[PDB]
Design an enzyme around this catalytic site. Structure first.
Site, PDB file in Angstrom:
ATOM      1  CE  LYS A  12     -14.985  -8.691   3.474  1.00 30.35           C
ATOM      2  NZ  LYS A  12     -16.071  -9.727   3.337  1.00 30.35           N
ATOM      3  NE  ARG A  52      -2.276  -8.415  -5.079  1.00 29.42           N
ATOM      4  CZ  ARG A  52      -3.250  -8.324  -4.168  1.00 29.42           C
ATOM      5  NH1 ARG A  52      -3.424  -7.181  -3.494  1.00 29.42           N
ATOM      6  NH2 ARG A  52      -4.062  -9.361  -3.928  1.00 29.42           N
ATOM      7  CG  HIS A 102      -1.970  -1.023   1.154  1.00 25.62           C
ATOM      8  ND1 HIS A 102      -2.284  -1.839   2.220  1.00 25.62           N
ATOM      9  CD2 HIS A 102      -2.813  -1.369   0.154  1.00 25.62           C
ATOM     10  CE1 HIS A 102      -3.300  -2.614   1.887  1.00 25.62           C
ATOM     11  NE2 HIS A 102      -3.627  -2.356   0.636  1.00 25.62           N
ATOM     12  CB  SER A 149      -4.716  -6.627   3.944  1.00 28.85           C
ATOM     13  OG  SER A 149      -4.172  -5.332   3.762  1.00 28.85           O
TER      14      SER A 149
HETATM   15  N1  LIG Z   1       0.729  -5.441  -2.824  1.00 27.46           N
HETATM   16  C1  LIG Z   1       0.105  -4.489  -3.545  1.00 27.46           C
HETATM   17  N2  LIG Z   1       0.705  -3.891  -4.614  1.00 27.46           N
HETATM   18  C2  LIG Z   1       0.060  -2.946  -5.337  1.00 27.46           C
HETATM   19  N3  LIG Z   1      -1.202  -2.574  -5.018  1.00 27.46           N
HETATM   20  C3  LIG Z   1      -1.841  -3.159  -3.959  1.00 27.46           C
HETATM   21  C4  LIG Z   1      -1.181  -4.125  -3.199  1.00 27.46           C
HETATM   22  N4  LIG Z   1      -2.003  -4.544  -2.241  1.00 27.46           N
HETATM   23  C5  LIG Z   1      -3.147  -3.841  -2.388  1.00 27.46           C
HETATM   24  N5  LIG Z   1      -3.058  -2.993  -3.431  1.00 27.46           N
HETATM   25  C6  LIG Z   1      -4.110  -2.048  -3.937  1.00 27.46           C
HETATM   26  O1  LIG Z   1      -4.613  -1.146  -2.942  1.00 27.46           O
HETATM   27  C7  LIG Z   1      -6.001  -1.410  -2.699  1.00 27.46           C
HETATM   28  C8  LIG Z   1      -6.341  -1.321  -1.196  1.00 27.46           C
HETATM   29  O2  LIG Z   1      -6.081  -2.549  -0.507  1.00 27.46           O
HETATM   30  P1  LIG Z   1      -7.124  -3.282   0.495  1.00 27.46           P
HETATM   31  O3  LIG Z   1      -8.476  -3.347  -0.188  1.00 27.46           O
HETATM   32  O4  LIG Z   1      -7.048  -2.558   1.806  1.00 27.46           O
HETATM   33  C9  LIG Z   1      -6.612  -4.989   0.855  1.00 27.46           C
HETATM   34  P2  LIG Z   1      -5.464  -5.752  -0.329  1.00 27.46           P
HETATM   35  O5  LIG Z   1      -4.086  -5.698   0.294  1.00 27.46           O
HETATM   36  O6  LIG Z   1      -5.663  -5.141  -1.691  1.00 27.46           O
HETATM   37  O7  LIG Z   1      -5.819  -7.318  -0.587  1.00 27.46           O
HETATM   38  P3  LIG Z   1      -7.122  -8.147  -0.061  1.00 27.46           P
HETATM   39  O8  LIG Z   1      -8.335  -7.424  -0.626  1.00 27.46           O
HETATM   40  O9  LIG Z   1      -6.931  -9.519  -0.679  1.00 27.46           O
HETATM   41  O10 LIG Z   1      -6.999  -8.121   1.454  1.00 27.46           O
HETATM   42  C10 LIG Z   1      -6.296  -2.762  -3.370  1.00 27.46           C
HETATM   43  O11 LIG Z   1      -7.591  -2.819  -3.989  1.00 27.46           O
HETATM   44  C11 LIG Z   1      -5.274  -2.872  -4.458  1.00 27.46           C
HETATM   45  O12 LIG Z   1      -5.842  -2.233  -5.608  1.00 27.46           O
END
Ligand SMILES: Nc1ncnc2c1ncn2[C@@H]1O[C@H](COP(=O)(O)CP(=O)(O)OP(=O)(O)O)[C@@H](O)[C@H]1O
Ligand SMILES: Nc1ncnc2c1ncn2[C@@H]1O[C@H](COP(=O)(O)CP(=O)(O)OP(=O)(O)O)[C@@H](O)[C@H]1O
Ligand SMILES: Nc1ncnc2c1ncn2[C@@H]1O[C@H](COP(=O)(O)CP(=O)(O)OP(=O)(O)O)[C@@H](O)[C@H]1O
Ligand SMILES: Nc1ncnc2c1ncn2[C@@H]1O[C@H](COP(=O)(O)CP(=O)(O)OP(=O)(O)O)[C@@H](O)[C@H]1O
Ligand SMILES: Nc1ncnc2c1ncn2[C@@H]1O[C@H](COP(=O)(O)CP(=O)(O)OP(=O)(O)O)[C@@H](O)[C@H]1O
Ligand SMILES: Nc1ncnc2c1ncn2[C@@H]1O[C@H](COP(=O)(O)CP(=O)(O)OP(=O)(O)O)[C@@H](O)[C@H]1O
Ligand SMILES: [Mg+2]
Ligand SMILES: [Mg+2]
Ligand SMILES: [Mg+2]
Ligand SMILES: [Mg+2]
Ligand SMILES: [Mg+2]
Ligand SMILES: [Mg+2]
Lengths: 156, 156, 156, 156, 156, 156
Positions: A41, A90, A17, A127
């Site tokens: 959730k 990703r 993030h 996450s």
């Molecule tokens: N490792 C990563 N690399 C690049 N972008 C990422 C990333 N992890 C998350 N993001 C982006 O940032 C956004 C916000 O993340 P979140 O919705 O809080 C959880 P997440 O880490 O994406 O995975 P999850 O939904 O499987 O828990 C995601 O929708 C994704 O678009």
């Protein structure tokens, strides 16, 4: 003044993030990290801890601010006087899925979405997956900012 | 002071392109359309026909300029005093290809890439496909801008 | 007595390749890197330059050998007294292409294929892309091994 | 001694699983089928029936053994003194999803993952889908080993 | 007499569905819209409202009829004396997923499946997403037939 | 009066093709196999060899006819008094490419496209891949029909 909202649940924020935050912050005047409520959730941390973890990991980003979102992302974005979303991607699957939400978000609100490709290093970092691994005792410490690690070393 | 480059061949520009142009011009202080040289292969239109076509379709975009690039996009980008590429994506497959390009560009030059999902109505438009159809007598006029339609008529 | 073959052109070997080599060498008694001949097209490097490059980067892998193949991979595989191919995969798209190849190889010769996901840090590395960037002056030295970097310097 | 763990829920085992078991067994010294507990998802059979169905369908595989897993796959694999996982893949989507788990599993534990492409015959075969069809009265008998069929002809 | 069944939950029907209905109706003698019961998933409308909304939006299609389905799609299709299903596809992901069900449906019942690509206009349109947006106050009116809009303007 | 066209090069026809033929012939009153001319490149087989091959493998399909097309498929389709194309799909990737083609065909000529998922057993069969394997001595006889196997023997 140009601007983009980065929405997500950030439960908890990952180095994945933070890379996005930085990369967005390098190209827009302001960035607003929007922490979205999911009333369905229940998750590992609550907002205060969430915001705090983002704030501690983003001190080096002046144009960035953190804020709680409610309701439709597009309503939130417009309430910031902005017209743009920034999300990481990703994989092509994520894209096929984010595409539909983005086209919907343009349709209903003129809000556009910009996507950045994940950094090779953190491509597998998410996450939910970091949680499960950490729950089961695996060392996810290299995938999360120290603010998050300290708080995890408290939930042991 | 915020700026992005849109690289491409634009042989010729389509409504899809114009859409990305507008969408980037709305979010960055400056947009530079970069017409990139390829030796293999030579296009249908010539370099100046392409600039003319891009200028003629972007008259409503005052923060948009057109330059011609040779070599690596990142060299061209760095030389505009910019650190950011903007591209449209049609499908998850597009993404997987461009993802490799994007990460390789970031590694070698700190240049980032922002991706924008195609508008629903032009998701099938690509210049190579429009050309193939026009060569065989199909009407692609609703997918290209008037300046282009014009130049195409005079090849019937 | 367990053995796998890694087929490819390795024009030139990259850190991505070396990673697959190590990963296969750790799990099979013998690994054979098979440098495959293609008539169309001729590479950048010559057949012996490629063997030299592969040997020079795999000195730490005692169970690894390098041979040169012509014709079908399965014929080459059967002739090493082996029944197994090992390949790296970058994306879901890679998989769909290689899936056809794999099933066709199994049908005609009982030769199976084991796939291994790219290491995060080299997911964008491919030899064709590294070559394209090097021809135009980009620094790809951190993506290739020293033996290769060496041979590339002497083409600047 | 080389080895790989095949993890899954095998509820119930399918001819799809058995093909993988065989193919893995042909290339490693030992294979350990690991039947993973999901405390959240109740399923059609319980472990004893699960193990029994795998044991009955894999009698022709001496180097293969069946065993209950708990906790992190990687912890299980390491507890077998092994460093490798073997999974089937039906599609590019599966791959995009398995990729992340595999890269996570390397990161936290040095455990590698090998993927085999499904056999064309059974590409549409999956436990959940076979269940639903069988629940609703469809004949899934050609997609499952006889040990599983006999037990289904008992749950009519 | 040729024929295809269009199954789905149609809760509620969208302009996306109606395009499919029309396109199917143009190529088969009869089309049967099959509204499938999900006893697990409660949804926004019940059958009578569902059927009614489809009937009101498909009056211009004589060869089309609307009907409640139960149990296995293939059993329903065969009970119509038909041997074909027609479904829309928005993306390659949908396809990878629909592929498995289609191959299963051929295996168990000789029922074939025909897929049509979504219309560019409605590619982002889906019932669940339109609901959520409409729940949260967004204007989805341009994505749904007037029969559906009137009924939504009643659930304000 | 219901009719579909199956366009392709069929250089040569495979069992995959024949499967699509049968599957379309079962659902439409008329099927027209359209052998499409490409200048770049010339095939392995000649136009009449291809018609002969298609006729010879479809003798059991009385509603199936073979014609040869030049130019746009939609022009050819409109000229058979038909409004519908039928094609097989192997993967999600195939779909994304054909989706662009399909929508572009519908836009320029009101011609729709119906897609049919590959049969599991021929999912890896494509004519280009079968040719490549046969040129190098692999046995592809179980993937092609006897008329084709025949013509291939006389090129050993
Ligand atoms: N490792 C990563 N690399 C690049 N972008 C990422 C990333 N992890 C998350 N993001 C982006 O940032 C956004 C916000 O993340 P979140 O919705 O809080 C959880 P997440 O880490 O994406 O995975 P999850 O939904 O499987 O828990 C995601 O929708 C994704 O678009
Ligand atoms: N219809 C469309 N909608 C959104 N983005 C598009 C688009 N068509 C093209 N783009 C994007 O704009 C960039 C510039 O395009 P070009 O390289 O000039 C040719 P093209 O129009 O993409 O089609 P082609 O490369 O298949 O001929 C591309 O990298 C592409 O990602
Ligand atoms: N960075 C990487 N990580 C993991 N596997 C890789 C990899 N790069 C290549 N491979 C795999 O190793 C095999 C041998 O590669 P080669 O055919 O020699 C050329 P390449 O490096 O894949 O790139 P190119 O084919 O796009 O030029 C490929 O089939 C590929 O699947
Ligand atoms: N038909 C098949 N062909 C090849 N590999 C398969 C396969 N079915 C399953 N596998 C592989 O073996 C693993 C173990 O399977 P399980 O997790 O027990 C259920 P499943 O049959 O994969 O499908 P499900 O998760 O939809 O029920 C899967 O993750 C998959 O990688
Ligand atoms: N916008 C669209 N364009 C083309 N086809 C569509 C479509 N929306 C739905 N379809 C097709 O018609 C079928 C019936 O739809 P439903 O199952 O009732 C809900 P949905 O609108 O597909 O999306 P959802 O499952 O996310 O709610 C879908 O499986 C899909 O194949
Ligand atoms: N094994 C298979 N199963 C189902 N459909 C197939 C198939 N092989 C080909 N088809 C479909 O039938 C159409 C006609 O094929 P052709 O264009 O003649 C060559 P091809 O056999 O697809 O392989 P190639 O184009 O990779 O050489 C293709 O558009 C393809 O979608
Ligand atoms: Mg999330
Ligand atoms: Mg291009
Ligand atoms: Mg290669
Ligand atoms: Mg499972
Ligand atoms: Mg649905
Ligand atoms: Mg072809």
């Amino acid at each position: 003044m140009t601007g983009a909202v980065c929405p997500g649940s950030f439960d908890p924020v990952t180095l994945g993030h933070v890379d996005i935050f930085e990369r967005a912050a390098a190209q827009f005047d302001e960035v607003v990290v929007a922490i979205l409520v999911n009333p369905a959730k229940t998750g590992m941390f609550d907002l205060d801890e969430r915001i705090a973890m983002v704030k501690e990991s983003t001190t080096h980003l002046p144009n960035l601010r953190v804020q709680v979102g409610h309701g439709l992302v597009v309503d939130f974005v417009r309430s910031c006087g902005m017209t743009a979303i920034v999300k990481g991607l990703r994989t092509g699957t994520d894209f096929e899925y984010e595409l539909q939400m983005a086209q919907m978000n343009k349709h209903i609100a003129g809000v556009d979405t910009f996507f950045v490709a994940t950094a090779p290093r953190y491509s597998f970092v998410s996450s939910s997956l970091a949680k499960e691994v950490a729950m089961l005792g695996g060392d996810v410490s290299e995938l999360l900012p120290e603010p998050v690690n300290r708080r995890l070393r408290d939930r042991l």
